[PDB]
Design a binder for this molecule. Sequence first.
Ligand SMILES: Nc1ncnc2c1ncn2[C@@H]1O[C@H](COP(=O)(O)OP(=O)(O)OP(=O)(O)O)[C@@H](O)[C@H]1O
Ligand SMILES: [Mg+2]
Lengths: 48, 50
Amino acid sequence: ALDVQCEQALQDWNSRGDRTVLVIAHRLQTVQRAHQILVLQEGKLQKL
Amino acid sequence: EGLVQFQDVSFAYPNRPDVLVLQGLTFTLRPGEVTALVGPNGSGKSTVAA
Ligand SMILES: Nc1ncnc2c1ncn2[C@@H]1O[C@H](COP(=O)(O)OP(=O)(O)OP(=O)(O)O)[C@@H](O)[C@H]1O
Ligand SMILES: [Mg+2]
């Protein structure tokens, strides 16, 4: 529930090199800039 | 029919009536058509729905 401008602003500055971050997204939206991607379906993890 | 008409509608919440959330909204919803209402947060869209 965030407008596009704020979504872009809060894209990847969360991490500071000493913070672990887990970004849960319904789709692959503004998450391709993440070091690791984990796809989950019906409670099972799918390898890339 | 389902034909809605906003005519210069303005609104301020009763708890804070000095601030106007909506100013001079004029538009019309006609049956068989879709009217998207887009904008940033706090613009007043949910206020229009209410
Ligand atoms: N019950 C309330 N009393 C006073 N102010 C309110 C109330 N509900 C909302 N507001 C204020 O009215 C303004 C518009 O809110 P509204 O929910 O209509 O905006 P919106 O554009 O639909 O928001 P969003 O895009 O985040 O869904 C905001 O500044 C909000 O803080
Ligand atoms: Mg809203």
